[PDB]
């Protein structure tokens, strides 16, 4: 069940697909970028075309849908990177495994592109150029998380395993989420950019 | 896509369901683990329907079978814990983040045993304070394997030049294994869950 926005991919499962500028795809993803990063160079944007990838994470999205009986479960998060772990996120995604864990050993995604944007995260290489995700995240219901964590804390220590879908600095006024297991977060596109 | 001979589960969507010895289903357990844990013996043979834990692990063995072009991909092995870790397991699954380091590490993964007697130390299926002890029955996606590195934190790359396209597991040894690490989640289904005694 492959988005309909996507390109053929010749009977294949894995492509990125740099977007035309200009068009609605390309300028609806730029504007997000640009509400806090318009002071960048973008290079390109790529859509990440991975069915595999995406096959897992609508089937986590739909059993997330059940759980919390409602579909407000997905946020559209950045997440900066190094050129070194672009191969990586593209074919294999998010990885707790692989900077800052001051709210959990999990994923760590950004609420604004300038967070995302820092060189910390989107580390420049050699050329200055920089790499941003816009990643579909399924934040679900959150909690504040704290060091050391490696799931969400439970809903209610009565029930430990019915646990929180992610952690957050700030529940009121959300900067960053955390999430601790694969195939909760689907790289959508691909941003190559400049200072 | 939930297996046609589970118990309904009335719209739940977890279940532990008790077998009964006679049953082939049982028999076929009670054999895998007595063929090396002979001196122990069982108390109860659990079938854990875990509806949401079977679709994504079920959704990685079709992945996994297209990638290899071959359905020798699935191995039935075992997974000692202790009773703290039996609730999340059953709801959660294998969780590497919590995996302990292993004797011999051969990477930062989830471990699964070939024979029960590993899985039966006690290090592993650690007595709780009734004496019992608590091993899973786990499919697991070995797939493509290579001799595990304690360094590892996901399986190494098949060609070095090839970085992403990695082996799906590791083992102790490639000839004759005996263990088997897993570092995704959804590589491992846990199907039954057997608690034995001395
Ligand atoms: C407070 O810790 C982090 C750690 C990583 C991280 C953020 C915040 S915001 C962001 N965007 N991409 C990566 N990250």
Redesign the pocket.
Same mark, same amino acid.
């Given at each position: 069940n492959l988005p309909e926005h996507w390109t053929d991919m010749n009977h294949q499962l894995f492509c990125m697909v740099q977007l035309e500028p200009g068009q609605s795809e390309y300028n609806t993803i730029k504007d997000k970028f640009t509400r806090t990063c318009s002071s960048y160079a973008i290079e390109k944007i790529e859509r990440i075309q991975n069915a595999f990838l995406w096959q897992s994470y609508q089937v986590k999205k739909r059993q997330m849908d059940i759980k919390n009986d409602h579909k407000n479960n997905e946020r559209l +998060? *950045?997440?900066?990177?190094d050129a070194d772990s672009v191969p990586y996120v593209n074919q294999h995604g998010f990885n707790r495994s692989c900077?800052? $864990?001051? =709210?959990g050993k999990g994923? =760590? *995604?950004?609420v604004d592109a300038s967070?995302?944007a820092?060189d910390?995260?989107?580390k420049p290489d050699s050329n200055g150029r920089k790499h941003? =995700?816009v990643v579909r995240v399924l934040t679900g219901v959150f909690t504040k998380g704290r060091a050391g964590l490696v799931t969400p804390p439970p809903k209610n220590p009565h029930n430990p395993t019915d646990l929180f879908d992610s952690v957050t600095?700030n529940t009121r006024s959300p900067? +960053?989420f $955390?999430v601790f297991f694969d195939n909760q977060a689907y790289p959508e596109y691909l941003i190559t950019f400049t200072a």
């Open positions: +998060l *950045f997440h900066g990177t900077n800052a $864990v001051s =709210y994923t =760590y *995604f950004a967070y995302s820092k910390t995260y989107s941003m =995700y600095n900067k +960053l $955390v």
